């Protein structure tokens, strides 16, 4: 790509952290130069604090401005709780059910073994639990999970794989628990 | 033990003269402001039927952010950013079935500064039909992530690559995908 001129980056992050609905709220305003946070306002502290030397003059200056501090102190209500209410019904309350499929892997590394894949896709929110069972008994060894993959479009996916050495008659179950369903989803593979 | 986090994230980058303003909820974008068209762009279309945001407020913040960047550049005695190159992964959004529409996702993660060149290639040739992408999304370590998307019809005869260039890389990174 060329153009190796030096670059200089300034980032601001106003973070509203919500605990138990909006029972407890913490506002953390952060200023970041390049990759280093320089100064922050933490509503649990109630005034600006420098994080590095570069942020010292800003915290000193902003802390001398009474109206500024009063607005920042009330922002847990006028900003965080306000914005939480604006979007609650389509963010906090968004629930999209996973699509769950089970299939043997197209590539089978070992003879007499069957790598099974449980694909859990399209869901929201990210909190999910995916388990494998063999004849009804949970497999707590031999399981590989890709972990939670955020797709960038308000959906997630995950893949959970089990190496079996199956016998005819055995029944393997992938079980998914997620806030969008009241009972676990299960998909079975019969060896 | 937090349940949720909403972040208003902004940046300005020189000498590119590039700014961004977005809101994030639990790591997903709610909206950003298009700096050129000067309008609010909702990440899912329906959000614009449920809420509003005055885009001119973002432009006013960005002007302040540009001026502040200049202040910090001088205050740091012109210390520039250290490039951090991205990690790139390509995956589909659902299990692949022959001739069943799907989407390829190119996930570009853990990089800074927020300037990248991304191209989808099919059989080595650039493809743009139906592609889309996100703006630069924040990370807790202050690096960035980004997603590019390519709807496609799986086939045994096509292979794909996500080609990514960034200042922290000395050569283009080509992340490959083909029907298994």
């Amino acid at each position: 790509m060329g153009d190796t001129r030096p670059r200089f980056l300034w980032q601001l992050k106003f973070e509203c952290h919500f605990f138990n609905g909006t029972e407890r709220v913490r506002l953390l305003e952060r200023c970041i130069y390049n990759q280093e946070e320089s100064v922050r306002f933490d509503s649990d502290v109630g005034e600006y604090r420098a994080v590095t030397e570069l942020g010292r003059p800003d915290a000193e200056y902003w802390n001398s401005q009474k109206d500024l501090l009063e607005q920042r102190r009330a922002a847990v209500d006028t900003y965080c709780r306000h914005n939480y209410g604006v979007g609650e019904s389509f963010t906090v309350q968004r629930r999209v059910e996973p699509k769950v499929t089970v299939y043997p892997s197209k590539t089978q590394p070992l003879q007499h073994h069957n790598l099974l894949v449980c694909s859990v896709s399209g869901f929201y929110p990210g909190s999910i639990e995916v388990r494998w069972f063999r004849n009804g008994q949970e497999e707590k060894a031999g399981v590989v999970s890709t972990g939670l993959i955020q797709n960038g479009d308000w959906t997630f996916q995950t893949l959970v794989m089990l190496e079996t050495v199956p016998r005819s008659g055995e029944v393997y179950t992938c079980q998914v628990e997620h806030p969008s369903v009241t009972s676990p989803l299960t998909v079975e593979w019969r060896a | 033990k937090e349940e949720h986090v909403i972040i208003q994230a902004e940046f300005y980058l020189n000498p590119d003269q590039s700014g961004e303003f977005m809101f994030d909820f639990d790591g997903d974008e709610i909206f950003h402001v298009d700096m050129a068209k000067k309008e609010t762009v909702w990440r899912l279309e329906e959000f614009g039927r449920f809420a509003s945001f005055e885009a001119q407020g973002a432009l006013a913040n960005i002007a302040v952010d540009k001026a502040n960047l200049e202040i910090m550049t001088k205050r740091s005695n012109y210390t520039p950013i250290t490039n951090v190159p991205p990690e790139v992964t390509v995956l589909t959004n659902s299990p692949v079935e022959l001739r069943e529409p799907n989407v390829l996702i190119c996930f570009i993660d853990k990089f800074t500064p927020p300037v990248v060149n991304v191209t989808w290639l099919r059989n080595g040739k650039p493809v743009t039909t139906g592609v889309s992408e996100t703006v630069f999304l924040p990370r807790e370590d202050h690096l960035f992530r980004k997603f590019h998307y390519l709807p496609f019809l799986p086939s045994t005869e096509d292979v794909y690559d996500c080609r990514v260039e960034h200042w922290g890389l000395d050569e283009p990174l080509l992340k490959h995908w083909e029907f298994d």
Partner: peptide
């Protein structure tokens, strides 16, 4: 329902 922003402050000069 309108999202509200926090205003960015001018740094010390």
């Amino acid at each position: 329902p309108k999202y509200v922003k926090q205003n960015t402050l001018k740094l010390a000069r």
